Amino acid sequence: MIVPVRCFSCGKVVGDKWESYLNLLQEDELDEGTALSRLGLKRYCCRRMILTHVDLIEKFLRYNPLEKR
Amino acid sequence: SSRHGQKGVCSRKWPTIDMPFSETGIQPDIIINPHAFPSRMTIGMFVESLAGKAGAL
Amino acid sequence: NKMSPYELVQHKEESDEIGGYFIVNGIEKLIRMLIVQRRNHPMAIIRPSFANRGASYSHYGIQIRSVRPDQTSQTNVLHYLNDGQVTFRFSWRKNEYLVPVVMILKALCHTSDREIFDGIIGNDVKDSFLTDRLELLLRGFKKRYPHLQNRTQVLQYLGDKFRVVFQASPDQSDLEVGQEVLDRIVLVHLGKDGSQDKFRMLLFMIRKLYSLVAGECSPDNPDATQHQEVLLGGFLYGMILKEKIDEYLQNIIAQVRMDINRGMAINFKDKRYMSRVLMRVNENIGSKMQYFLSTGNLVSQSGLDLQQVSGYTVVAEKINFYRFISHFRMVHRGSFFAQLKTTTVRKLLPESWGFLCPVHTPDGSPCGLLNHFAHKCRISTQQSDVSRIPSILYSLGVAPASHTFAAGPSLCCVQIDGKIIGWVSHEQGKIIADTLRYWKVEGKTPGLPIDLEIGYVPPSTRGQYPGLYLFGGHSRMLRPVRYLPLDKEDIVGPFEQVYMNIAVTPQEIQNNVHTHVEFTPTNILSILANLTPFSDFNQSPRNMYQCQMGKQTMGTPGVALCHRSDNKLYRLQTGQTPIVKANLYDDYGMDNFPNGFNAVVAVISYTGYDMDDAMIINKSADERGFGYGT
Amino acid sequence: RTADFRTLERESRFINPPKDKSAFPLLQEAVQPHIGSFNALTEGPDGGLLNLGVKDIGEKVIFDGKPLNSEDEISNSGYLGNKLSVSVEQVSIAKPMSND
Amino acid sequence: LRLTAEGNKWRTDILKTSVDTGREAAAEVTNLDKDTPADDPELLKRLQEILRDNNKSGILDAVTSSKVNAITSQVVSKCVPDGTMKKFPCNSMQAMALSGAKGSNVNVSQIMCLLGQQALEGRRVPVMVSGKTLPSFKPYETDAMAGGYVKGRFYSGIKPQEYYFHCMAGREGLIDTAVKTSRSGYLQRCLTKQLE
Amino acid sequence: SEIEIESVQDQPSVAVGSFFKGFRAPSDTTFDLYKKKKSEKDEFVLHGENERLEYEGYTDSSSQASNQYVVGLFNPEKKSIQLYKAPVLVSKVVSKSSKNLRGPKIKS
Amino acid sequence: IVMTASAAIKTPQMTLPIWNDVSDEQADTFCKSISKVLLSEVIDKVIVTETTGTARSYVIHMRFFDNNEYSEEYDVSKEELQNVISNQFIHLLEAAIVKEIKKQKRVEANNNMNKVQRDRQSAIISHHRFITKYNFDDESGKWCEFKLELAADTEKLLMVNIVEEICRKSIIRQIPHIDRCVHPEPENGKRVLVTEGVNFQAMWDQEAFIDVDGITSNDVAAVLKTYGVEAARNTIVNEINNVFSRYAISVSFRHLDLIADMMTRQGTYLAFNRQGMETSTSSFMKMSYE
Amino acid sequence: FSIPDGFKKCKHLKNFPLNGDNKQQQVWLIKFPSNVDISKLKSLPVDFESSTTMTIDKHDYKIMDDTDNMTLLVPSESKESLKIASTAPLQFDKVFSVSETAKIPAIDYSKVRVP
Amino acid sequence: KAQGRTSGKVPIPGVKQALEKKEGLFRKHMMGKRVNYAARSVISPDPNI
Amino acid sequence: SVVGSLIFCLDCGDLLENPNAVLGSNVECSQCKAIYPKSQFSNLKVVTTTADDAFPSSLRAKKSVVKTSLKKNELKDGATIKEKCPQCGNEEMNYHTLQLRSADEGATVFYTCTSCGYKFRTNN
């Protein structure tokens, strides 16, 4: 679903870094290792929270019962 | 359970206050006893542990 | 049906909707695949239960499972008696019947007694074993049945005795009733107006019976995965449906007979008398098919060729996606074998390499009885055409079977889908079997499909009965390997694989033994057995337990959950993809259905509260949402 | 080995489902034993396995009890009446619809 | 779990001496002398004769299973205390097995040295009608590996042929529990009702 | 070693029958020969009688579309041969004496 | 043991201690003197040349092994074969032929018998039904030969399959209720012989090889019938101990003595079953059991 | 008979001079697949044992000789058109079989097993 | 002991079958019973008791 | 024509009747007719040998070229498995493994001592 607000192990706020992360991969064409280190994630517990997130909310939102089609 | 047949019941939810902490500052999310390894011989979990930490870095 | 992932979302389904199941009262159910015997191949089998069918029954017999081109099956068993007598068993409307085999042989086509004798004894006249059994069978018939001298007098007799059981009408004469017996029961895969071919196969099945009681041939194992195939769910659904529509035609006749037993008013040419009959015939066949799919209980007045009457359909569970996808790779031996105390059926065997997973079977009572297919195993659905294959074998050294009469394990009988079409030597038969695999993977030969399996059985001492069996029909397990000349993909079935040397890696190809190589050694595993990370480093009872525990995690059932009304669902809230994953994780699209989460795990004994099966969760991780689900 | 997770490729496919044939084609070849088996009931050679099976169960003949009051022969006993031979020669499954 | 660089060479040198154990156990059972080669046609006629009999196959299994369990126990003797990288008052996999906390030296040897012979109800790996134990192998392959002698260890992973034989030994224990529904519940009830 | 083929005959000189092993057919008898022409193929039919026996043959559909045989004639002074097309006949023996048949019910 | 009090054990055995002067070569010869030997075991081939014409003559020719071979494997002399083939075997063979007809209705080149062979042959034609010839290799014990004649009325008869069933029934030498006697490894000095089957009446007569005072069975009801109830009670504590000692499970003997003394409380060998419960005083125990 | 039509009879038949004296006329029965046209070729390479290989337009053929039973039928004169040829059952002296072979190629081991 | 119609799966098992089975009345309700003042739960480990 | 004890007619292909139980001294084809009042055919001697499986024994097994029986004391499963056990003085003990539990608890080892033979078993 949506990005976790905090990291499970450390407790850093991580939820503000998911849209920043997808732009470092798309626009700047960084690899995942450089993109996580420019976001300021450097404990590997805090790295895997953004590195490994699936983001299924984009797949749930297509099933909207409140709008036509 | 992990992906190696190492299932386990959650026996106690242990506070971060008194869980062991690393040089990095990390408290682990799950503690598994090393006495669950010698009779099960699930060595795929030992190599997953260092493969997964290499990938997070 | 022909519908994009975009359009599937707009019609309130998942984007990768899988299908393959039935919605019956809102419960998703599917027809479970079963293991049955391979069609159209006679199996030399010993069963101690054959001696239990009466005194003077040996425990030897030949068994063939003949399927009609509408997938309806018919098992004919050929018993050997301790008198030298051979009897022909069949089953019709849940009643066994026994007939002497020289009555069928004398009723199929016009014969002399040399032609039966010549077929059983092609050459090898000087074998005193086989030639003294054979006059007990000829003079057993001429003594017991002395007034049956031609084909239209044995069919008269056989229609007399089988008139009531086949439910024949009085306008059918006895050389028509007895011909319906020989079109509906004996060797139905060769079909009607093919009685010359049903004659030659019986002469093949009798000498293979005599070659079994002499010890020259080892008995075929009906549990050995080369002698069995898969009864598919949709094929069973049309077998059951044919019986229901067959009953519908009988209930009309039951309704008209209840009017000639009241003398009411009968003009069959009346258009409205027909409408007067069909209003009272029960014709809700579609609700009888729903009853099969709602319960699994198989009600059939015939009895199909199947050995149980229940458990044919299961509930497609959605507790996660791994549970759901593995209903469709699941195959079952049969519920008849769950009650046995012998573990020979529960045993992992080397002929299952590449066709059934060594790992993915449950634990407990169904262990070894419920097993899953391999990752790249495919099951035939249509029958590939074989009309051009006899012309190609005659171009090779195959003498035609119509004018050869050369039975025996000293030759190689060539068959296509269980129709004997000729005879060669064992040397020439290996050149035929090798060049046809050369013509098959090189697609420049017009008549050979690629999924034709070429079952060459070489000669031996007391081994399997030799032959050159070709199969192209439905329901065959098939898997891809690489044929090493030409480096192309080849398709191999499990009847072939016993005699083929197939290297695991290309590095282990030795000279002049391996003709094939695996594409990847991971083709032999399951889907769920292939996602386990580094599973070649674990003890094998732990990989079998992960295939069991992975079906029971709370993960993602789907993302179209608001248009569902399931009894219970288990949804883990925030899944993650694995850092350590297999390459096939991506190919099956398992990222649409995240099953778990990455955890920082410490292997430490620290707390004292984690022993024998116990772990310790972090509390502040849990308060921050770790492992939450609804 | 290197085996990447396709993080931009996943999020593009979540937001924008494909308007062509599906990605992940090995997932539809996992249930090809079930779907293809059911598809052979209506499609394929000889009209499919249902139309090919209604002709194996061909005729169901019964007669009446009424006489011809025919000529005094063994045909006078050997006449059975008019011959009803009911049969089925075609079966079709309609793709599902809803009614009034 | 690691052997030291010397001890990892010790198990290499001993397991090189089992490339010929399957043939020398074969030529003993078939009574052929002066080290006939594996591909000898008069050997392959005899091994087929052993295949067709359950008694004769039990002799070939029990001779060869003795000669590879000799090779197995030399590796465990040479390597398990003396050739490991980390030793007992720091090596926890040895400390758990030696204390009786959890495990045995059999478990430690299958991790660090080799799995050894996979035995299926007292016999060796089953073999098809064609004389093959897998499609990977030649018919009548006189080899220890072809009969299911796993020289691999769980530290370094096992090969796909010997992965398949180890799944055979993992299911033979689980099927015996599957034949173990109700055994002793009525034996004790009959004793306790009389001896109440 | 080689052998020169001299003549090839389209027309039916010689046929070849296939009976049971030991079949005699005493040399008084002669069997007629009937032929099908469906504008590209050949399907022959054998038939012949004598005083007690009356018995026929035919060719097989699967065989003759794919496998022709040739009756050869070799004189080793020639180092050459001449050839003729030979059909192959699958022939039975029905006895004329035992072409009997009874009533289609029990008559009771 | 505990349930059912079976007098018919699946594998009844008997343990026979041998003396301290008898050797291993003397004891292996002794095991052969006990074990049952079928006539099937000494036969290499049976060649049957059926001939019809003239009565259907059946010429049954037996190949045995070499005489030194079966004498040094089964302790069987060639004179014992004669008194089994002529006396026992051919009565069974003709009893199987007439029975099979009853269901049918519903190298070497040798010659020149002497007087005694000519007299032995006519002795056998009187005693049997369809025989008319007999011979035996009296010199080397290698072959036997007898040439039946049945009528001309009977048709084909699978003579080889009949001979094989009769040969696998005919015993050359069997002491009853005993099949096999073997010489195992001496475990803790007890040089013993284990016997497949129980007959104490016959091993008493073998006292020059066997210490008859220590012969032990596992059949409890056989010991109860022969040696009494205290000897049957010592058998039950030794048998239940051997069930647990083969699993390295140790139960105390104070438990096993109480079970064996409860089974022998009426002088007989009762079980822990419904019939063992029958002779007891409390009815509510009985009603609540089954 | 009075069989249905299509089966037009063979009124006239050709000559086959098998005389059988006592150099002599050996009677052969050779096979061919229906694809090879017999008048197109001129020579038939024969062997004592089963070792030949002829090549006619990229198709390799072979005699798989099986010399050491089917009845010869000669025309009576030209009309009744059957005599079982005999001597006092006239066995063929030689029976051959031209069978199509193929060439399976050798495995290039240098390419297919990469280290 | 009363067969009657003999149609299979006979109901109303009578006052003997209330007494004779594994359940019966003696085994299920006299020899073993259900009790007041009892409880059950999953167990967890503890080194501190 | 004669095949062993069998005889067939060369016209009708039928099986002839066996010339022993005939009445009035004639045999013939039954489909067509042949003529044999003499019962011309000779004695038909059909030699049948028993199968070389039919009499299994300890002496037939010694006539096998391969080994059919192990030696008595020449098999001990190759033991040098160092287990310091207090059983007699022994260092060695033979072993064997399975998986008897519900696929979750580990393998329990089947130990077997050698020197004293005294059975000692350990799970953990």
Cα E104 to chain centroid, rounded: 17
Give the pair of three-digit tokens for residue D75: 């045909």
Q: Do chains G and H touch (3 or more CB pairs under 8 A)?
A: no
Cα G66 to chain centroid, rounded: 23
Which H helix or E strand runs over J49?
strand J46-49
For residue E166, what are the CA distances in angstroms to C285, E118, E150? 50, 7, 8
SS3 C180: helix
The residues that bridge with F70 in the sheet, in sequence order, are F85, H30
Which residues in chain J have their CB less than 8 angstroms from residue F24's CB? 10-11
End-to-end CA, chain D: 61
C-beta separation of H15 from F13 below 8 A? yes
C-beta separation of C597 from C575 below 8 A? yes
A60 is an annotated ligand-binding site residue: no
Same domain, C207 and C127: yes
Cα G220 to chain centroid, rounded: 21
CA angle E61-E63-E65, nearest 5°?
65
**Nearest to residue F97, comparing CAs of J28, C176, C157?**
J28
**Computed from CA positions of residues J57, J62, J68, J70, in that sequence, does the dihedral angle turn out positive or negative?**
positive
> Tokens 């803790």 sit at which residue?
G188
Residue F31: phi, psi to the nearest 5? Answer: -115, 130
A55 is an annotated ligand-binding site residue: no
Own/partner long-range contacts of J86-90 (Cβ < 8 Å, ≥24 apart): J87/J113, J87/J115, J87/J116, J87/J118, J87/J120, J88/J115, J88/J116, J88/J118, J89/J115, J90/J114, J90/J115, J90/J116
Which H helix or E strand runs over E42?
helix E41-51
Q: Is B56 on the interface with A (CB under 8 A)?
A: yes
Rounded to whole angstroms, the Cα distance separating C244 from D57 reads: 11
Which residues in chain G have their CB less than 8 angstroms from residue C143's CB? 155
For residue C442, what are the CA distances in angstroms to C222, C469, H105, J29, J64? 34, 21, 12, 57, 48
- CA-nearest residue of chain I to G287? I26
Give the pair of three-digit tokens for residue C585: 């994780």
Bridge-based pairing of strands C614-618 and B9-14 is parallel
**A26/D14 Cβ within 8 A:** no
Same domain, C442 and C356: no
Q: Is I47 on the interface with C (CB under 8 A)?
A: yes
- Which residues numbered 55-94 in H keep a CB inside 8 Å of some CB on F? 69-76, 80-84, 86, 89, 93-94
* CATH code of C442's domain: 3.90.1070.20
Residue C229: phi, psi to the nearest 5? Answer: -145, -175
Same domain, C463 and C347: no
What is the SS3 string spanning B6-48? CCCEEEEEECHHHCCCCCCCCCCCEEECHHHCCCCCECHHHHH
Give the structural domain span for H47: 1-115
CA angle I3-I4-I7, nearest 5°?
85
C-beta separation of B13 from C509 below 8 A? no
3-state DSSP: chain D helix, strand, coil percent, rounded to 5?
25, 10, 70
- Which residues numbered 69-88 in C keep a CB inside 8 Å of some CB on B? none
C-beta separation of D95 from D38 below 8 A? no
Give the pair of three-digit tokens for residue J104: 């979750």
Structural domains of chain A, ranges and CATH numbers in brackets: 1-69 (1.10.10.60)
**Nearest to residue C182, comparing CAs of C170, C171, C169, C197?**
C197
| Burial grade of D19 (CB within 10 A; 0-12, 13-18, 19 or more) | exposed
Edge-to-edge strand ranges of the sheet holding G13-17 = G180-182, G192-196, G13-17, G216-217
**Nearest to residue B30, comparing CAs of B39, B17, B19, B44?**
B19
Cα E129 to chain centroid, rounded: 22
Rounded to whole angstroms, the Cα distance separating I43 from G97 reads: 75
Give the pair of three-digit tokens for residue D45: 């050679």
Q: Which residues of C122-148 are buried (b: 16+ CB within 10 A; e: fewer)?
A: bebeebbbbbbbbbbbbbbbbeeeeeb
Residue H102 DSSP class: -
Q: What residue type is G138 in one-letter code?
A: D
Residue B11: phi, psi to the nearest 5? Answer: -95, -30
Rounded to whole angstroms, the Cα distance separating H27 from E63 reads: 61
SS3 C457: strand
The residues that bridge with G49 in the sheet, in sequence order, are G59, J47
SS3 D92: coil
Q: Is J109 on the interface with E (CB under 8 A)?
A: yes
Give the pair of three-digit tokens for residue E196: 């109440």
Q: What residue type is C393 in one-letter code?
A: L
**Angle subtended by helix axes C195-213 and C101-108, to nearest 10:** 150
Q: Concatenate the DSSP letters of all residues of A21-43 into one string.
A: HHHHHHTS---HHHHHHHTT--S
The residues that bridge with I10 in the sheet, in sequence order, are none
End-to-end CA, chain A: 23
Give the pair of three-digit tokens for residue C242: 């044919």
Give the pair of three-digit tokens for residue D30: 């996992």
Distance (Å) from the C-alpha of residue G5 to the closest C-alpha of chain E?
13
Give the pair of three-digit tokens for residue C97: 């019947």
Give the pair of three-digit tokens for residue A1: 């679903």
> Tokens 């198709």 sit at which residue?
H59
J112 is an annotated ligand-binding site residue: no
SS3 C596: strand
The structural domains of chain J, with segments of one domain joined by +, span 1-124
C-beta separation of C166 from C184 below 8 A? yes
Residue C336 CB contacts under 8 Å (≥ 6 apart), including other chains: C307, C308
Edge-to-edge strand ranges of the sheet holding C399-400 = C399-400, C419-424, C412-416, C467-471, C453-457
| Burial grade of A63 (CB within 10 A; 0-12, 13-18, 19 or more) | middle
Residue F71 CB contacts under 8 Å (≥ 6 apart), including other chains: F13, F14, F16, F83, F84, F86, H16, H27, H28, H29, H72
Rounded to whole angstroms, the Cα distance separating F67 from F69 reads: 7
Give the pair of three-digit tokens for residue E119: 């035995």
C-beta separation of C251 from C244 below 8 A? no
**Computed from CA positions of residues C458, C463, C468, C470, in that sequence, does the dihedral angle turn out positive or negative?**
negative
* CATH code of E58's domain: 1.10.132.30
Q: Is G243 on the interface with E (CB under 8 A)?
A: no
**Computed from CA positions of residues B20, B22, B27, B30, in that sequence, does the dihedral angle turn out positive or negative?**
negative
Give the pair of three-digit tokens for residue C96: 């066994």
**Nearest to residue C554, comparing CAs of C601, C584, C593?**
C593
**Nearest to residue C496, comparing CAs of C187, C48, C41?**
C41
Give the structural domain span for C376: 20-39+222-232+307-381
SS3 C403: helix
Neighbours of chain H (3+ CB pairs under 8 A): C, F
Rounded to whole angstroms, the Cα distance separating C308 from C329 reads: 21
Q: Is J83 on the interface with C (CB under 8 A)?
A: no
End-to-end CA, chain C: 33
Give how many domains chain H has, as a whole number: 1
Give the structural domain span for E99: 1-159
CA angle H60-H62-H66, nearest 5°?
165
Rg (CA), chain C: 29
Q: Is D93 on the interface with C (CB under 8 A)?
A: no
Bridge-based pairing of strands F80-86 and F67-74 is antiparallel
For residue G143, what are the CA distances in angstroms to E50, G82, H20, J98? 31, 11, 54, 53
**E187/G285 Cβ within 8 A:** no
Q: What residue type is G11 in one-letter code?
A: T
Interface test mutation site (partner F, options C402, C404, C417, C420, max chain F beta carbons within 10 A) = C402
Rounded to whole angstroms, the Cα distance separating C617 from B12 reads: 7
Rounded to whole angstroms, the Cα distance separating F57 from H80 reads: 15
Neighbours of chain C (3+ CB pairs under 8 A): A, B, D, E, F, G, H, I, J
A38 is an annotated ligand-binding site residue: no
Rounded to whole angstroms, the Cα distance separating D55 from D91 reads: 10
Interface test mutation site (partner F, options C195, C398, C403, C414, max chain F beta carbons within 10 A) = C403
Rounded to whole angstroms, the Cα distance separating C590 from C576 reads: 11
What is the SS3 string spanning chain G? CCCCCCCCCCCCEEEEEECCCCCHHHHHHHHHCCCCEEHHHHEEEEEEEEECCCCCEEEEEEEECCHHHHHHHHCCCHHHHHHHHHHHHHHHHHHHHHHHHHHHHCCCCCCCCCHHHHHHHHHHHHHCCCCCCCEECCCCCCEEEEEEECCCCCCCCCHHHHHHHHHCCCEEECCCCCCEEECCCCECCECEEEEECCCHHHHHHHCCCECHHHCEECCHHHHHHHCCHHHHHHHHHHHHHHHHHCCCCCCCHHHHHHHHHHHCCCCCCCCCCHHHHCCCCCHHHHHHHC
